[PDB]
Design a protein around this ligand. Structure first.
Ligand SMILES: CO[C@@H]1O[C@@H](C)[C@H](O)[C@@H](O)[C@H]1O[C@@H]1O[C@H](CO)[C@@H](O)[C@H](O[C@@H]2O[C@@H](C)[C@H](O)[C@@H](O[C@@H]3O[C@@H](C)[C@H](O)[C@@H](O)[C@H]3O[C@@H]3O[C@@H](C)[C@H](O)[C@@H](O)[C@H]3O)[C@H]2O)[C@H]1NC(C)=O
Lengths: 220, 215
């Protein structure tokens, strides 16, 4: 069951280097061409580069906008494909996906992606505050709780509740950029009695700072 | 390169109804080997894109018969009869006949019956005070359509400065949106007032939904 997985993203300067890693499994890796497609907010989906088979001398093909700066390599023995990126620039900002060169003539399977941000701005782990009722009468489904994530940079941060075990009625708004910093909030609605007799916690992750934040809403 | 333009940009459709997305290329996609490499993909909210149709009309593994692909010269189309909840997301058309390029995308939105928001208001956490600012949040849950008006009232007087509204995507299960209005004051500003109200005004009600708290 095809599963591709990218990694190695974060914040770079205008103009540093960074290497992406992709690990595929669930198919004879050596039998397929591998791809790299980035998705910028400003330029949608953009094919970056491709690498072919061994019988192909491991031929590579790059997108005009990255010829010379990016280099795609592979390791059939490890079922991995890499993307060395040098001389990065604002324009290279975007989510990078590692896809397979399908037998059908189309990038059939994609990874979840790994974000890359080029900027002179520096990292800032997020600050997480609790969203607790505010002492009131029960008249709104049955108990809404949340975590407010502020002052972080870059993007993104992923919020999960109870390590992902709690996944029903979770609502996470979109992040907004303000004062050079992002923020958002995630909320979940639980039954009036499952809380606080039972513990609820949000799991805020911020790849760029490599930090994972765990906080539990008690009913203060 | 080869440009792929998709229309419409945004598309509302009732459940069970039909929908047609078109994709036009700047040039002929017919490959020398007589194959037209035109594909369509679906990217659900917060997910990697997925292959639906390959080579104009072939459906990929696990794709329902609901998805159909046709083509004629440089104009191509994706059809979705019996549209449903899980079909919401952005649809792309791509071509690999030449240097791979993708289409701008089309946001399929599920048109459903109006839903009344469920307001909740959270006062700032003492944990935030040391940052020098206080954020009061008003959460509008499970409502349809998207549109909504939130107004804040501090000690009666309507306030506009310091507000930030942000929406969620359409929900895959029930097709409703959620939205939070955040009011951020400075530590002291917030301590010079006591009654904080927010009034929500939706299509589903003449009288604003009002939620409030006092310190
Ligand atoms: C400028 O136009 C392109 O380059 C010219 C030099 C060439 O004459 C012209 O045909 C264009 O060819 C494309 O070149 C770019 C890179 O420059 C490639 O990225 C394109 O590949 C497409 O997209 C891939 C994701 C997809 O895997 C390709 O499909 C393969 O090749 C075609 C010819 C076969 O019909 C198809 O079955 C598939 O090949 C099979 O599966 C792969 C995994 C395996 O390695 C093969 O041995 C075979 O079993 C393609 O759609 C490239 N376009 C094309 C159509 O090749």
């Amino acid at each position: 069951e095809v599963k591709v997985e990218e990694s190695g993203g974060g914040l770079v300067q205008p103009g540093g280097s960074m290497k992406l890693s992709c690990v595929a499994s669930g198919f004879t890796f050596s039998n397929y061409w591998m791809e790299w497609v980035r998705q910028s907010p400003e330029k949608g989906l953009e094919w970056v580069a491709e690498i072919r088979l061994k019988s192909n001398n491991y031929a590579t093909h790059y997108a005009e906008s990255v010829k010379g700066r990016f280099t795609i390599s592979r390791d059939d023995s490890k079922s991995s494909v890499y993307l060395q990126m040098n001389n990065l620039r604002a324009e290279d900002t975007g989510i990078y996906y590692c896809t397979r060169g399908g037998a059908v003539g189309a990038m059939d399977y994609w990874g979840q992606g790994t974000s890359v941000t080029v900027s002179s701005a520096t990292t800032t782990a997020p600050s997480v505050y609790p969203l607790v009722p505010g002492c009131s009468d029960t008249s709104g489904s049955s108990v809404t709780l949340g975590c407010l994530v502020k002052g972080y940079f870059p993007e993104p941060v992923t919020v999960k509740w109870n390590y992902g075990a709690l996944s029903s009625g979770v609502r996470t708004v979109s992040s907004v950029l303000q004062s050079g910093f992002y923020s958002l909030s995630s909320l979940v609605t639980v039954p009036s009695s499952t809380w606080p007799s039972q513990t609820v916690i949000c799991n805020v992750a911020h790849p760029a700072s490599k930090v994972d934040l765990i906080k539990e809403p008690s009913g203060p | 390169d080869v440009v792929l333009t998709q229309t419409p940009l945004s598309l509302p459709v009732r459940l069970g109804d039909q929908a047609s997305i078109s994709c036009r290329s700047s040039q002929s996609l017919l490959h020398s080997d007589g194959n037209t490499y035109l594909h369509w993909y679906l990217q659900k909210p917060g997910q990697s894109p997925k292959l639906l149709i390959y080579k104009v009309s072939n459906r990929f593994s696990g794709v329902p018969d609901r998805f159909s692909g046709s083509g004629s010269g440089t104009d191509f189309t994706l059809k979705i009869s019996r549209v449903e909840a899980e079909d919401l997301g952005v649809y792309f058309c791509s071509q690999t006949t030449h240097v791979p390029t993708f289409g701008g995308g089309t946001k399929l939105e599920i048109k459903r019956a109006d839903a009344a928001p469920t307001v909740s208001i959270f006062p700032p956490s003492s944990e935030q005070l040391t940052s020098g600012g206080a954020s009061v949040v008003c959460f509008l849950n499970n409502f349809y359509p998207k549109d909504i008006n939130v107004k804040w009232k501090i000690d009666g007087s309507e306030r506009q400065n310091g507000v930030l509204n942000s929406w969620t995507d359409q929900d895959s299960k029930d097709s409703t949106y959620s939205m939070s209005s955040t009011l951020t004051l400075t530590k002291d500003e917030y301590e010079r007032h006591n009654s904080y109200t927010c009034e929500a005004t939706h299509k589903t009600s003449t009288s604003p939904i009002v939620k409030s708290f006092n310190r």
